[PDB]
Nucleic acid binder design. Structure first.
Ligand SMILES: O=C(O)CCC(=O)C(=O)O
Ligand SMILES: [Mn+2]
Length: 204
DNA sequence: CTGTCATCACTGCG
DNA sequence: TCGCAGTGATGACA
């Protein structure tokens, strides 16, 4: 197993293909059968005073007794199911990092996406990495430095682009999430679904 | 309670 | 097809 070190100013991440094709295919099939995604209010978001559907399906799973916040609201993730525990255990066995929570984002095709953002670290264990595991269609992932955004950025730090492949793990390490925003842009030629699992270590 | 700060994804272009 | 510029109500925080 080979790791690519992704390095830039205030960016430290590591990328590998963690699951081979056969295993990744099995896992994808099981995620597609079993994951229960949000419906109703949790699948809506208000942006500049207009209501939209979240442009991807989402779900959370995690340890018993954990709660988290979604926009001021206190929520409980769903209990682990075996396929998710299988993924988590492989990530932990390889990296030595442990997680108690996962956010699942399912992009039905290239029109589902997520805009430039930094992960909310407020309820995360201090200094903890985030482990991003991907199954299904490859999708382009983009890191952009915080001071290189918008119309007249103060700095011209180069963007960092990579595809996240089927069965891959991207470890995003501190201080990546302080200095960089990441996104999964629209890619209209991608017709197939992708399921991404972002494992986190939440306080408690 | 107040006031600052960061934030989410769309439309309408080019 | 890609992606820029412009669009604010809301919650975190001190
Ligand atoms: O789908 C992805 O790889 C990114 C998801 C992500 O960054 C997030 O939900 O915080
Ligand atoms: Mn993220």
């Amino acid at each position: 197993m080979s790791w690519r070190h992704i390095r830039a100013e205030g960016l430290d991440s590591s990328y590998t293909v963690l699951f081979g094709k056969a295993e990744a295919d099995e896992i994808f099939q099981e995620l597609e059968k079993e994951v229960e995604y949000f419906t109703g209010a949790l699948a809506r978001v208000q942006v500049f005073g207009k209501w939209h559907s979240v442009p991807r399906k989402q779900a959370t799973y995690g340890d018993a007794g954990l709660t988290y916040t979604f926009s001021g609201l206190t929520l409980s993730p769903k209990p682990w199911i075996p396929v998710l525990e299988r993924i988590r255990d492989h990530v932990s066995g390889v990296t030595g990092q442990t997680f108690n929570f996962v956010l699942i984002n399912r992009y039905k095709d290239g029109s589902d996406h997520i805009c430039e953002h930094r992960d909310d670290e407020r309820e995360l264990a201090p200094g903890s990495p985030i482990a991003s595991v991907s199954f299904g269609a490859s999708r382009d992932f983009v890191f952009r430095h915080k001071d290189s955004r918008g119309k007249s950025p103060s700095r011209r730090v180069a963007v960092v682009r990579l595809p996240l492949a089927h069965g891959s793990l991207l470890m995003m390490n501190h201080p990546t999430n302080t200095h960089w925003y990441h996104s999964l842009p629209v890619r209209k030629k991608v017709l197939a679904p992708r399921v991404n699992l972002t494992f986190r270590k939440i306080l408690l």
